[PDB]
Design a protein around this ligand. Structure first.
Ligand SMILES: [Cl-]
Ligand SMILES: [Cl-]
Ligand SMILES: [Cl-]
Ligand SMILES: [Mg+2]
Ligand SMILES: [Mg+2]
Ligand SMILES: [Mg+2]
Ligand SMILES: [Mg+2]
Lengths: 395, 395, 396, 395
């Protein structure tokens, strides 16, 4: 008797970043579910994938068969395993989980095993043009109670002279950046000590052997993790990196394929998995990945940037709450508009997030207010990255 | 405010086999859980492990924290990873899942992802003094609707002449056995054709190279799987077997340790994992193992012998209904007394089991009728197996 | 026509810790064997395994067929390889070896190959709340003649992280604070005590694998005798990575209960010392095989010798130690007068060496009347409920 | 204080084959041990090694420290690990286990674990000029109760025409031999069925790839094992063989070095280990090897040819009785002179050996009687083996 009746996409940008949220409606009045489908750079293609394909696929189906729906939806177009398609899956799969919590009168984290911890430790971003400005941010965050911070200085060497004419793009200098990082952590550790945990994100910006040298050279500074030392396309290089360095490694925010993460985890080539939950297809595959990670002694560090709706932020945190091998939660602070469009955002208190104990994902969306923040769209400029000679780089 | 108030063990043998069942009670009316702790050969030590250690560990705690309770209970005695300790964990763990289901008003399979299939295909046992009587039992089961059957002939050579005086034991002949099997199956395929699926259990009765030769020789007869070709102590020999044979392999009913199954599944050394759910610690670790197997393309075939309670049977089947990588369910038909003592046994109809949609595991125990069948105790004769020269062997 | 006539458990706690000892009686009056079955956290379940299962299995059987009995008892329940079941095996196994030595008029170490050394070097525990207390305790043990010491400061960090606003009960620790703190501790010890003294540190599975690898690398200059339990049994695959990078000697194994745990480690040279609790792997018979397998791979023995092992198990450790060419070290926990009185025959301790007597079998007895005067406490220890700062239940 | 007072070597040939036996005497009345040092082709050098080196090394030492003495003697001349050195070591070591047994009042097998089986299954040799005389020898042995036989025909081809000149030697033809073996076994299996167990010894006579083909071609004939398909110098070729063949393999009669057997056993490259007990250093090292093998699921098959003293026959069998992984025992019938010179020979009855229950090794030597059978000495012809072109080969 219980059936899905409609599946819609809501495009909104209350925090200044384009989000896509899927609402799954049922034939029981007042019962619906929400999921995150935020691939911010391709939101109009996610909307199209949802509206043209997922909706007619799902109408009339029983929403509680979460796994049957996930498996059959994922193969419905034959070709599969990519970010746009995975996000259409995630919008729906999170919405079904959310519905299931509502039917059970339980938060999703109670369905997945119950609380494994009393609060969810967070890290946040601290930027700076130089060593002194970065420290200032770290200081401001420490006073708010963060015990973990990600430290970047500048924009990856944004130093060598270019040729006499340049093709447009955002120019960076990988070797300049690579030499400056150790100097940054020497300063920070000297200034602030070793109580505070540091994360640094290489963001696939240097060649693999440069990343290996960096990992080795940062060993004295004891990072919580070094993130993204290679692109997904270069993951075989981690065999060599892990023969030589003891700095903790994270990878995975870019992953969209089991053949990317499985070999890393099987071989202990990373210490934290960083997948963007919606980008791997939602709660159902993320839970599986978390378990695979757990048995291999690898911990989770779900991607938590600004380009994730509060619905996905709840999703991450429900997974965090119920995972024994939870590592840490990246967190990007929200504005008032986001909290008003999405009542139920988790409470943030002194470096910890406390999720509410409302049923499902414990999160709502106000469609009326959402319409007041239409999406910008447009090509981001920062993904056009060039090295000093003008070579287009993975950004 | 919800609390565990009592934990007790019930020993009963309605089917003529010593069963152990754990009841977990709470301070909410009508809200309790049952789980299976059946390790039938050490039932009195499992009772001691539950009564002396688990029960005081649990009284007063929040039963919804299934993962936290499982993790902390499993390390409560420091040493861990064994069949008695695991069965004590399982009795609690399945009971906590049973309780969660009741709180949510849902079958456990609904909590674990929902229905993946319309029914659970079963296999049953068929024995016989010879190729003629085995074939008669196979026909009988095919009339009842079974489409998969396990074929054994005799008791593994129970032939070389023994020495002049024999030390007591159940004597078998591993070489006579191994030669006779391929003839068993040549006869069965000629008789019955290739429509019916056949399983054969080596039960660790031969040397590893002998099992490899047996697996190779049975290839033409196309077994659904060849079970336990090696003892858990000899798992490294499966590397050799899998370079040479294409007969599908199941392993794991004896497994109690992740270091036993993780290497085999990681290297594609088996096709079906056979763990006895309570012996690995219950639904919680069993679900993780199902997922681990899933990502590696290995399917489940949970142990379903006579020495498992109807509660453990229901756990198997709830795992079976929510696993996309479900392989097959071994089934031992129950007598009237078992169905009377355990209200809610799955319905068995033409080779399929159909679970009820009742909340939790959908199963209960009548404590008064259970008392009419006290456990026998004693040590089984069959675990004292000797080869022709008198050597004590892994049964 | 020698036969086993009865098998019984004695549960006693003369040193404040609960012990289980097995007595195997025969139809030869006065001839019996004693074995250690001490799994202290589960002694009542161990007692049940022996009383309900081992007893009927063994009554009537010829006690001299140690290997046959071990093999047939180990698989008597079909399921096998776990701490309670191995301890019931061990109680019987050591008791049979004890009987064989009594029949032969020889200590067990004589049946296992005879003396390979002239005494058994020991290490003792030295703890402290801070660097100086550790060092003071070290100086006190050196004065008693100890030449190896295990050094732990504090309780695994329990500058610690702030926890969330409510805490679930448990014993709280902070693995990152602990990790940072260890190298500082050894730099102090070495600067104050020099390099003559041998140091052992136990990580006790308290940190993530890559943290332990970093720790092993950082400790290299301080030259530990061994770094113990860098990973949990569940994580042994991480030792492949640690052994590609660190030259700190490693020991593993007090938690081991399964061959599929230790065989790949030793085959691949992933550790330098095997640390099994002898009763927890099933007694002298399997311990001797492990020692031999180790030897051929160049790995040495360091059998677990905590407070929670009876003096009979201690004698077993030492008869194995006396007869192994690849003996590494023997952890020793000093006994009080009550242990010595309940178990006459305890080995002599003298200037960091232990000297086993030359009486037949394990050379140890039990005064059953005196044993009854120290009943077992029981209960659940609090320490195995360990939580990191956010509240997560941890491997203790 | 118990001390070794004398060590002498006794060379004798009661069975037509040069034997060496060591007697270690002590300062306790009636307390002496015997052991085997029989490297029959080099007996005179083995006597020199014992008389000039071992004897003075031992005098005045305590014979109960078997392991200390073994370890320290093994390295007493610095260089080590060879057949002559090992044999001198065996002679003392077996003697010391013999002394320990007499002190204990127990058979050596009781010191090593107690009885593991009720008697020792034997195999014997059956040779023949052709396929039909071989059969006749098999029937003869079957009448005497042997259930396992080793089947060879002729002399490994002893067919291409050789060059016009021929260097002296025993000529064979490996290519003709390889092609004859599978035909021998097909004939024998056709005539004798699969009740009787067959062994075949390739004796390092063919190239490695030829042995692999042989191993595969014989699979249908189901040998108990195929022995020595490669020379010790060619063990790396077993990796290839075991990827392709399921015929059980035995190796090791020629082994004298741990780096020979340890790789084969770790990697499951053999099923039976075939070492000559005295040629690896006696009971002490063989027992360690039996245990290393057991932990890897490999079974023992100690060398039991004519060039072993009945003292060595007794040591094989005391190992055989106390080994859970015993596989089979090769046995060469003794004549009346051997049984007269060596009182305490095992009783042989219908294909089983039954060792006496006397203390130590239960065997002794009549020195006066031994002197009536002096050692011929000399150089055997058979080890000068040539292929058709004249090439000196591994015999
Ligand atoms: Cl799609
Ligand atoms: Cl037991
Ligand atoms: Cl020599
Ligand atoms: Mg990043
Ligand atoms: Mg089975
Ligand atoms: Mg320790
Ligand atoms: Mg040979």
């Amino acid at each position: 008797k219980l059936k899905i009746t409609n599946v819609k996409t809501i495009l909104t940008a209350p925090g200044g970043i384009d989000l896509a949220v899927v609402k799954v409606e049922t034939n029981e009045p007042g019962l619906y579910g929400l999921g995150c489908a935020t691939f911010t750079q391709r939101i109009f293609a996610v909307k199209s994938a949802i509206d043209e394909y997922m909706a007619p696929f799902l109408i009339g189906k029983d929403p509680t068969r979460i796994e049957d729906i996930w498996q059959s939806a994922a193969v419905s177009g034959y070709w599969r395993n990519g970010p746009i398609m995975n996000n259409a899956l995630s919008g729906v799969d999170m919405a079904l989980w959310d519905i299931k919590g509502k039917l059970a009168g339980m938060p999703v984290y109670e369905l997945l095993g119950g609380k494994c911890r009393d609060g969810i430790p967070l890290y946040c971003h601290t930027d700076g043009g130089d060593e002194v400005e970065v420290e200032d941010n770290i200081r401001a965050r420490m006073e708010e109670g963060y015990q973990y911070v990600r430290c970047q200085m500048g924009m990856y060497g944004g130093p060598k002279r270019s040729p006499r004419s340049k093709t447009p793009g955002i120019y960076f200098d990988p070797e300049a950046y690579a030499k400056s990082v150790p100097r940054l952590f020497e300063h920070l550790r000297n200034k602030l000590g070793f109580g505070i945990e540091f994360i640094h994100d290489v963001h696939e910006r240097v060649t693999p052997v440069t990343a290996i040298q960096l990992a080795k050279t940062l060993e004295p500074y004891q990072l919580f993790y070094l993130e993204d030392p290679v692109a997904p396309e270069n993951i075989d290089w981690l065999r060599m990196l892990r023969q030589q360095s003891s700095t903790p490694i994270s990878m995975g925010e870019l992953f969209v394929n089991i053949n990317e993460w499985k070999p890393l985890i099987d071989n202990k080539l990373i210490d934290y998995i960083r997948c963007h939950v919606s980008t791997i297809g939602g709660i159902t595959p993320a839970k599986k990945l978390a378990v695979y990670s757990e048995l291999n002694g690898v911990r989770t560090a779900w991607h938590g940037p600004g380009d994730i709706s509060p619905v996905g932020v709840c999703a991450n945190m429900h997974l965090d709450m119920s995972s024994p091998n939870f590592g840490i939660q990246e967190y990007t602070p929200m504005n008032d508009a986001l909290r008003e469009v999405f009542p139920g955002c988790p409470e943030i208190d002194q470096g910890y997030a406390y999720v509410n104990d409302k049923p499902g994902l414990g999160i709502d969306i106000n469609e009326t207010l959402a319409e007041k923040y239409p999406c910008d769209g447009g090509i981001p400029s920062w993904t056009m990255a060039r090295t000093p000679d003008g070579t287009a780089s993975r950004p």
